[PDB]
Write an enzyme that holds these catalytic residues in place. Structure first.
Site, PDB file in Angstrom:
ATOM      1  N   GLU A  35     -10.520   4.953  -0.069  1.00  0.00           N
ATOM      2  CA  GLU A  35     -11.175   3.660   0.001  1.00  0.00           C
ATOM      3  C   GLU A  35     -11.872   3.180  -1.262  1.00  0.00           C
ATOM      4  O   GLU A  35     -12.710   2.295  -1.193  1.00  0.00           O
ATOM      5  CB  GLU A  35     -12.131   3.627   1.171  1.00  0.00           C
ATOM      6  CG  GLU A  35     -11.446   3.930   2.456  1.00  0.00           C
ATOM      7  CD  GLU A  35     -11.936   3.056   3.545  1.00  0.00           C
ATOM      8  OE1 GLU A  35     -12.072   1.835   3.313  1.00  0.00           O
ATOM      9  OE2 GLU A  35     -12.189   3.589   4.638  1.00  0.00           O
ATOM     10  N   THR A  40      -5.439  -1.599  -2.987  1.00  0.00           N
ATOM     11  CA  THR A  40      -5.631  -3.013  -3.293  1.00  0.00           C
ATOM     12  C   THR A  40      -5.116  -3.315  -4.690  1.00  0.00           C
ATOM     13  O   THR A  40      -4.557  -4.379  -4.934  1.00  0.00           O
ATOM     14  CB  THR A  40      -7.071  -3.416  -3.163  1.00  0.00           C
ATOM     15  OG1 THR A  40      -7.568  -2.902  -1.929  1.00  0.00           O
ATOM     16  CG2 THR A  40      -7.192  -4.927  -3.143  1.00  0.00           C
ATOM     17  N   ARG A 170      -7.563  -2.799   5.542  1.00  0.00           N
ATOM     18  CA  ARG A 170      -7.695  -1.354   5.358  1.00  0.00           C
ATOM     19  C   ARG A 170      -6.437  -0.828   6.089  1.00  0.00           C
ATOM     20  O   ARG A 170      -6.310  -0.995   7.300  1.00  0.00           O
ATOM     21  CB  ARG A 170      -8.960  -0.845   6.064  1.00  0.00           C
ATOM     22  CG  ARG A 170      -9.745   0.255   5.361  1.00  0.00           C
ATOM     23  CD  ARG A 170      -8.974   1.577   5.193  1.00  0.00           C
ATOM     24  NE  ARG A 170      -8.428   1.772   3.835  1.00  0.00           N
ATOM     25  CZ  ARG A 170      -8.190   2.961   3.268  1.00  0.00           C
ATOM     26  NH1 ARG A 170      -8.448   4.099   3.913  1.00  0.00           N
ATOM     27  NH2 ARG A 170      -7.653   3.025   2.060  1.00  0.00           N
ATOM     28  N   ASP A 192       0.270   5.910  -6.451  1.00  0.00           N
ATOM     29  CA  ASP A 192      -0.987   6.032  -5.723  1.00  0.00           C
ATOM     30  C   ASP A 192      -0.832   7.300  -4.875  1.00  0.00           C
ATOM     31  O   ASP A 192      -0.071   7.308  -3.908  1.00  0.00           O
ATOM     32  CB  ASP A 192      -1.176   4.795  -4.844  1.00  0.00           C
ATOM     33  CG  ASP A 192      -2.412   4.868  -3.975  1.00  0.00           C
ATOM     34  OD1 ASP A 192      -3.173   5.844  -4.049  1.00  0.00           O
ATOM     35  OD2 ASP A 192      -2.620   3.922  -3.208  1.00  0.00           O
ATOM     36  N   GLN A 196      -7.128  11.954  -1.063  1.00  0.00           N
ATOM     37  CA  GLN A 196      -6.992  13.321  -0.557  1.00  0.00           C
ATOM     38  C   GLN A 196      -6.057  14.212  -1.430  1.00  0.00           C
ATOM     39  O   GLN A 196      -6.095  15.442  -1.311  1.00  0.00           O
ATOM     40  CB  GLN A 196      -6.511  13.255   0.912  1.00  0.00           C
ATOM     41  CG  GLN A 196      -7.074  14.328   1.862  1.00  0.00           C
ATOM     42  CD  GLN A 196      -6.728  14.068   3.324  1.00  0.00           C
ATOM     43  OE1 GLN A 196      -5.559  14.104   3.720  1.00  0.00           O
ATOM     44  NE2 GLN A 196      -7.749  13.803   4.141  1.00  0.00           N
TER      45      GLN A 196
END
Ligand SMILES: Nc1nc2c(ncn2[C@@H]2O[C@H](COP(=O)(O)OP(=O)(O)O)[C@@H](O)[C@H]2O)c(=O)[nH]1
Length: 330
Positions: A35, A40, A170, A192, A196
């Site tokens: 996040e 984005t 999201r 990307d 994690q």
């Protein structure tokens, strides 16, 4: 321009029969906590360097927008309970129940004039707004306010999500996501990997500035991660770009939250200028080989296309000026 002249001194396409048609490539790895704004940034490359999102495309995100809104209000309402907040007007306590009745009867995201009403009345409530404003105390979507305030438009029967509605979503990402786009005749392969690559051309490391008062500490877990990255041996010859993201939420947050929540020793003024400058310094300072390696920091609002375009144009010049020679022709 200097980057233009820099590009011009290359002689490698001459070594290829039809080298003037060759593709110069830039492998760009996108890192940062979950996040932090990675996805984005990926959407903004679509929007900026491709067509973006077509009406048909944006239409596919409707239930996501609905899903997000629903989750956002439920998170605030559920919070009121754990935080012991009362509804400004106790009639709302009946809509709260209705929210769970309507939400609890669907497998997927949806919007009805009925649900729209319940949410509008809840969002407008003082007690709810009181809970909302205390969001650093619980898990709440960043776009919660964005969507919630535009309920009327989102609720419209024949609603079509705007590109911004799409960027504010999201979405559960899993796995590496690879995007290819061309900018300045450079063919970028953007990866990307999720919050994690020994020879990536450049790395864009995203940081959610607004995670500072979220109360190991969030800001510090990102610092820990950036330390590992810019200092890793593999990245010695890679341009390390730092995106201190969500400057918009941080601008509004630093107004009422002190940076000392995150950095207890911070003694500067609690202003956007000083507090943000502190953060940048805190990060660029993790760099061991300062003599050798430079960190390119940019304050970004990933959902702001103009800003991302501006910033990406800048980021791109740094790659040409610093890494083109390490970039292959395919
Ligand atoms: N206000 C605001 N929201 C942002 C910004 N960057 C990303 N978001 C929102 O933060 C949420 C998570 O970002 P996302 O790109 O999914 O993060 P990821 O987990 O790093 O991929 C989404 O709701 C985004 O729209 C930013 O600069 N400002």
């Amino acid at each position: 321009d200097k980057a233009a002249v820099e590009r011009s001194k290359m002689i490698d396409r001459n070594l290829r029969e039809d080298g003037e048609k060759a593709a110069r490539e830039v492998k760009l790895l996108l890192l940062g906590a979950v996040e932090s704004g990675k996805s984005t940034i990926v959407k903004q490359m679509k929007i900026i360097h491709e067509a973006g999102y077509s009406e048909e495309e944006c239409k596919q995100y409707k239930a996501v927008v609905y899903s997000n809104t629903i989750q956002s209000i439920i998170a605030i309402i559920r919070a009121m309970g754990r935080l012991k907040i009362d509804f400004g007007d106790a009639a709302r306590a009946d809509d709260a129940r209705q929210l769970f009745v309507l939400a609890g009867a669907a497998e997927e995201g949806f919007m009805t004039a009925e649900l729209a009403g319940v949410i509008k009345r809840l969002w407008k409530d003082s007690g709810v707004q009181a809970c909302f404003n205390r969001s650093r105390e619980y898990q709440l979507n960043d776009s919660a306010a964005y969507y919630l305030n535009d309920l009327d438009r989102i609720a419209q029967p024949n609603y079509i999500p705007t590109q911004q509605d799409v960027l504010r979503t999201r979405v559960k990402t899993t796995g590496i996501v690879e995007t290819h786009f061309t900018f300045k005749d450079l063919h970028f392969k953007m990866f990307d990997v999720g919050g994690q690559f020994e020879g990536v051309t450049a790395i864009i490391f995203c940081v959610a500035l607004s995670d500072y008062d979220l109360v190991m500490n969030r800001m510090h877990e990102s610092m820990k991660l950036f330390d590992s990255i810019c200092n890793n041996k593999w990245f010695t010859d890679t341009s390390i770009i730092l995106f201190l993201n969500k400057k918009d939420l941080f601008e509004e947050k630093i107004k009422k939250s002190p940076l000392t929540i995150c950095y207890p020793e911070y003694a500067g003024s609690n202003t956007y200028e000083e507090a943000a400058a502190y953060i940048q310094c805190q990060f660029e300072d993790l760099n061991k080989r300062k003599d050798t390696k430079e960190i390119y920091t940019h304050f970004t609002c990933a959902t702001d296309t103009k800003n991302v375009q501006f910033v990406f144009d800048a980021v791109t010049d740094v790659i040409i000026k610093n890494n083109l020679k390490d970039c292959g022709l395919f």
